[PDB]
């Protein structure tokens, strides 16, 4: 299995809302007997690795936004969240990943990483990650509306 | 400074419940992560169990799971560990640990209590 | 689940002498190992927090480094006062997180 990134640079105006995504390519579930722990963080473009390290999205760390359900599932992140933090991480069963951002800032800006981590045999050693950008801007210089620019 | 003091730790027989409480103080407790961990008399330390800051994860040990109850009063300030059908080998120290929260959201335990000992014996 | 395998399980070196434990990962963990000192009595103390971070008011004697699987912890200089079990422990994106079994370090006199 392998986590595709449709789009690498994410650019906004604040007090927009913004979706980033992750297409989980290929489930590769001989079967059941596998759940799927799903996140989102912020990271760094770092020298040894990258989406090494974990920094929370708007206080809230990779826990808060983790998604735990077998392949077959679907499954989102409560409504609590959504309304207080303005954060709603989303998967369901056409490969999509997503987290959902509501009234953007210019503290959101960062470089953003999904996982998805294969659980099985009580064993999750099977891990891919994906990382795009994020960039809120401000200004009249800065766009309407969003813009995502595609992956090479 | 950031204190953590358990306390509901004691003697109870095999099959028998029991319920700790740890009372912070000198923190927001509403905000950080709590974990339980437990230390068998002279052995290494065992997790037992995890609590997010507004509770909307919640993670057990398999050796705990649908016996222990974990569970926090914000309000209160309070963090508790609920225990049931007790066995021999749950005789240890029982340490409530903060995770080193802030800005740089950190998961590591920078805050234990001093610990309450719970013994399983007829 | 992740087990970490920490060596020496015990140790004796002499005031002045470097002391190294290791902690070794059944997986990659990136760099995501604490490393908490437990003296006779006390409870645990974070001194070391993703295999190289510092705690603070933390003696600049002690030391961490490690990536993936293989990781140290390292006194520069022991000290009596650093008589305790040091513990390793694991802190992955899944829930069992796990430690190491421990280092006792008693001084040579």
């Known amino acids: 299995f392998k986590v595709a990134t449709p789009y690498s640079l994410y650019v906004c105006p604040e007090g927009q809302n913004v979706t980033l995504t992750c297409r989980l390519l290929g489930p590769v579930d001989k079967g059941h007997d596998v759940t799927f722990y799903k996140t989102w963080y912020r990271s760094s473009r770092g020298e040894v690795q990258t989406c090494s390290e974990r920094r929370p999205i708007r206080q809230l760390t990779f826990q808060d936004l983790h998604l735990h359900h077998g392949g077959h599932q679907a499954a989102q992140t409560s409504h609590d969240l959504a309304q207080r933090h303005g954060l709603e991480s989303a998967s369901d069963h056409h490969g999509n990943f997503s987290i959902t951002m509501r009234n953007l800032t210019l503290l959101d800006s960062g470089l953003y990483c999904c996982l998805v981590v294969e659980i099985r045999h009580h064993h999750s050693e099977h891990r891919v990650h994906g990382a795009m950008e994020l960039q809120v801007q401000t200004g009249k210089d800065a766009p309407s509306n969003c813009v995502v620019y595609p992956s090479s | 400074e950031v204190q953590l003091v358990e306390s509901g730790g004691g003697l109870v027989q095999p099959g028998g419940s029991l319920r700790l409480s740890c009372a912070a103080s000198?923190?927001?407790?509403?905000?950080?992560?709590m974990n339980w961990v437990r230390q068998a008399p002279g052995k290494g330390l065992e997790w037992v169990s995890y609590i997010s800051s507004d509770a909307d994860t919640i993670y057990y040990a398999d050796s705990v799971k649908g016996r222990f109850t974990i569970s926090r009063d914000n309000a209160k300030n309070s963090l508790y560990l609920q225990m049931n059908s007790l066995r021999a080998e749950d005789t240890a120290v029982y340490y409530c640990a903060r995770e080193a929260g802030g800005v740089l959201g950190r998961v590591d335990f920078q805050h234990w209590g001093q610990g309450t000992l719970v013994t399983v014996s007829s | 689940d992740i087990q970490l395998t920490q060596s020496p399980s015990s140790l004796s070196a002499s005031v002045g002498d470097r002391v190294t434990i290791t902690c070794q990962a059944s997986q990659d963990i990136s760099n995501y190992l604490n490393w908490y000192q437990q003296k006779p009595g006390k409870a645990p103390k974070l001194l070391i927090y993703d295999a190289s971070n510092l705690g603070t008011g933390v003696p600049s004697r002690f030391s961490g480094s490690g990536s993936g699987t293989d990781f140290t912890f390292t006194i520069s200089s022991l000290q009596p006062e650093d008589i305790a079990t040091y513990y390793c422990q694991q802190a992955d994106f899944v829930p069992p997180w796990t430690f190491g079994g421990g280092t006792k370090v008693e001084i040579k006199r």
């Open positions: 000198g923190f927001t407790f509403d905000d950080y992560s």
